[PDB]
Amino acid sequence: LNSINTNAGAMIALQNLNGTNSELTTVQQRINTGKKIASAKDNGAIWATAKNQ
């Protein structure tokens, strides 16, 4: 397969790079906010528990 119209390997490399970007973003947000759970998106149950407490 030597196509000039498609490049599946670039697609898979993009998926891996986007996942690494998601990890780097969640870690920098965790470093900035100082909390493993800074919002309901992180984990809603313990988030609501911590709000009430």
Binding site: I4, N5, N7, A10, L14, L17
Partner: protein
């Protein structure tokens, strides 16, 4: 916070994800070279007629 959210929404609607075009650019450049070579080959079809006379 709402202004930041609206700007992020405009960026979602409009912004290109340039990592795909980084590959599409090289692919279309190779396509342009192959197409110019194919046209240069197609132009020469008349030359064979002279050999018959």
């Amino acid at each position: 916070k709402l202004q930041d959210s609206l700007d992020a929404g405009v960026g979602n609607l409009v912004d290109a994800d340039l990592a795909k075009e980084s590959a599409k650019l090289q692919s279309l450049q190779t396509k342009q070279q192959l197409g110019v070579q194919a046209l240069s080959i197609a132009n020469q079809s008349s030359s064979s007629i002279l050999s018959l006379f």
